[PDB]
Amino acid sequence: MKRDGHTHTEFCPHGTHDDVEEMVLKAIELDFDEYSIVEHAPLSSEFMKNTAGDKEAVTTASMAMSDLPYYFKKMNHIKKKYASDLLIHIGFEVDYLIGYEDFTRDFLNEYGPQTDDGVLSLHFLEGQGGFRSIDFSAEDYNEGIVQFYGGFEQAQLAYLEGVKQSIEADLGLFKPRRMGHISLCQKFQQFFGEDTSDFSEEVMEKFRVILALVKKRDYELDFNTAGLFKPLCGETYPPKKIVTLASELQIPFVYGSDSHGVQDIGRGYSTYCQKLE
């Protein structure tokens, strides 16, 4: 079986704007038999008033609430059109917004019924001047988060604390059960002269606490290969060491290409397969 549980569409402001249909055709060409469309859920309007850093990171983050009806219509159309070649799931990559669980829970309670899969991801942390992006750019990440927390490791620990909160969070019945790329704090590794070969003992303990909790919650993890194709990253989310700990805990992994265009489809799938061994 070949499944991709993390893909995006033309409804993504920062995507390549390729049509999801062309992405689905490519996935079929590459023998995938299960495919999930988890587009970025609209951010909280309140949340957007409390951010700092590059505005593009926010304005470009996701589609508007008004686009929702159109998103579901298009995706439900593609789902049926290709049901014969691919089992397509429709959902959202839901942003865990620290301090805004009510908003998220309300959003999920309303639109959750129209979804069939999902991913809960941490993309913003409190930083210099307000909420800051973890993945917009190396310079932005450095000024908004790394310097704010005191250093790369301090940033790692604040990031994992956020991941821990997203797992513990009560976001209703429709809360995603697959945690997105749980080592996103490494996306700009090399810009800080860092890599996954030397996670400190504290960082490792937080990962162990996080994993034990994922198991207890009976959640699963997004094995995201996007990192293998980012200039300053070069690693899968999460790295081998974490994958091994998770597997030993029988925590399920679902391959996630995090595709934002046709050319991303299927990327790093072999790595995913081998890394699980």
Residues binding Fe ion (CB under 5 A): 93, 121, 258
Which lies closer to Fe ion via its Cβ, residue 95 or residue 153? 95
CB of residue 39 vs Fe ion: minimum separation in angstroms?
8
Nearest distance, CB of residue 174 and Fe ion, angstroms: 18
Q: Which helix (H) or strand (E) holds 28?
A: helix 20-29
- C-beta closer to Fe ion: residue 121 or 186: 121
CB of 71 to Fe ion, least distance (A): 15
Element (H, E) at 13: none
Instruction: Assess contact for 136 and 110: CB atoms under 8 A.
Output: no
The residues, ordered by sequence, that sit 6+ positions from 222 with a Cβ below 8 Å of its Cβ are 5, 6, 119, 121, 178, 179, 180, 181, 182, 237, 253, 254, 256
The CB-of-248 to Fe ion minimum distance in angstroms stands at: 26
> Between 121 and 196, whose beta carbon lies closer to Fe ion?
121
Q: How far is CA 246 from the centre of its chain?
A: 18
Output the smallest distance, CB 252 to Fe ion, in A. 19
175 touches 217 (CB < 8 A): no
Q: Which is nearer to Fe ion, 91 or 144 (CB)?
A: 91
Residue 121 or 166: the one with the smaller Cβ distance to Fe ion is 121
Residue 189's closest CA among 150, 155, 165, 160? 155
The least CB distance from residue 92 to Fe ion, in Å, is 10
Distance, CA of 176 to CA of 263 (rounded, Å)? 27
CB 174 within 8 A of CB 187: no
Between 85 and 116, whose beta carbon lies closer to Fe ion?
Answer: 116
Backbone angles phi, psi at 208, to 5 degrees: -65, -45
